[PDB]
Design a protein around this ligand. Structure first.
Ligand SMILES: OC[C@H]1O[C@@H](O[C@H]2[C@H](O)[C@@H](O)[C@H](O[C@H]3[C@H](O)[C@@H](O)[C@H](O[C@H]4[C@H](O)[C@@H](O)[C@H](O[C@H]5[C@H](O)[C@@H](O)[C@H](O[C@H]6[C@H](O)[C@@H](O)[C@H](O)O[C@@H]6CO)O[C@@H]5CO)O[C@@H]4CO)O[C@@H]3CO)O[C@@H]2CO)[C@H](O)[C@@H](O)[C@@H]1O
Ligand SMILES: *[C@@H]1O[C@H](CO)[C@@H](O)[C@H](O)[C@H]1NC(C)=O
Ligand SMILES: [Cl-]
Ligand SMILES: [Cl-]
Ligand SMILES: [Cl-]
Ligand SMILES: [Cl-]
Ligand SMILES: [Cl-]
Ligand SMILES: [Cl-]
Ligand SMILES: [Cl-]
Ligand SMILES: [Cu+2]
Length: 235
């Protein structure tokens, strides 16, 4: 149970984005139904009045929280991967439009899931803005919590992988458009009951055998990390 509070750009807090530049749902409940339109940008997908301006090569940091800003972020039980996708805003997230910019699942050195790392990062994880066409975009940050993913929602609707999905409205201003955005996958559609990483038992299967759901990260993606970039108590 987690939500995005706002974003930072190059380590500068853009301010509370809830219902402003984030297409915020009304609460932190998960999405579980893989075929639902809620998979696109959660349960209240609509245009919100602001977009955050960035330039290619900028660091865009999502900041998540549980109840209040910079709290415990998400329950530590919610082990799982984190991804970020991008689509053009003109799509409204419909169609084969979602391109993966970032994936982190299980880190064998530190023996930590992405979610664990996110808590340590005070809710912050980033992507570097790619060299796509200037214009308006949706960045879709997705946390998958696997604590009840040994069942499939489609078979048992009280269990299933949980998706915490947040779409940010981002305007890319300066960019030379040298890596124009390739085709995308659909949400809903990309994840199905047979997709690797959707049904998994994190209690009896070693985490090293976990494979996150495709698609793979776009070759044109410029990187990203789960790491604190700014201190919410000060700015
Ligand atoms: O040798 C070890 C053996 O381990 C076995 O594996 C076991 C393992 O031992 C055990 O840890 C595991 O137990 C998990 C359960 O299966 C799973 O269902 C459970 O789900 C919890 C979850 O931990 C918890 O975080 C979650 O809390 C929700 C809550 O439901 C929700 O209502 C609340 O909502 C509020 C919002 O948070 C709040 O912001 C808002 O204001 O109000 C909302 C409404 O009040 O949100 C919280 C999260 O914040 O609830 C679920 C239960 O619903 O997680 C357990 C793990 O902690 O089971 C494993 C299998 O039994 C191996 O199988 C064996 O081989 C090994 O030998
Ligand atoms: C899952 O979503 C699909 C598409 O909206 C819908 O038909 C189906 O009824 C949903 N499943 C449940 C259990 O609500
Ligand atoms: Cl839960
Ligand atoms: Cl603010
Ligand atoms: Cl759902
Ligand atoms: Cl708050
Ligand atoms: Cl950190
Ligand atoms: Cl550029
Ligand atoms: Cl579907
Ligand atoms: Cu939860």
């Amino acid at each position: 149970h987690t939500l995005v509070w706002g974003v930072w750009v190059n380590g500068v807090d853009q301010g509370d984005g809830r219902n402003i530049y984030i297409r915020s749902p009304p609460n932190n409940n998960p999405v579980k139904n893989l075929t639902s339109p809620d998979m696109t940008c959660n349960v209240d997908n609509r245009v919100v009045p602001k977009s955050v301006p960035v330039n290619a090569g900028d660091t865009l940091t999502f900041e998540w929280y549980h109840n209040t800003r910079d709290d415990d972020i998400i329950a530590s039980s919610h082990h799982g991967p984190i991804a970020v996708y991008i689509a053009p805003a003109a799509s409204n997230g419909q169609g084969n439009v979602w391109v993966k910019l970032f994936e982190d699942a299980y880190n064998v050195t530190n023996s930590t899931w992405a979610v664990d790392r996110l808590i340590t990062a005070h809710g912050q994880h980033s992507v570097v803005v790619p060299h796509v066409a200037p214009g308006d975009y949706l960045f879709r940050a997705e946390i998958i919590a696997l604590h009840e993913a040994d069942s499939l929602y489609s078979q048992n609707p009280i269990r299933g992988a949980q998706f915490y999905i947040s779409c940010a409205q981002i305007t890319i201003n300066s960019s030379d458009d040298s890596t124009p955005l390739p085709a995308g996958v659909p949400f809903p559609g990309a994840y199905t009951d047979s997709t690797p990483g959707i049904q998994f038992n994190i209690y009896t299967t070693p985490a090293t055998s976990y494979v996150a759901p495709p698609p793979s990260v776009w070759s044109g993606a410029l990187g990203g990390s789960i790491a604190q970039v700014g201190d919410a108590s000060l700015e």
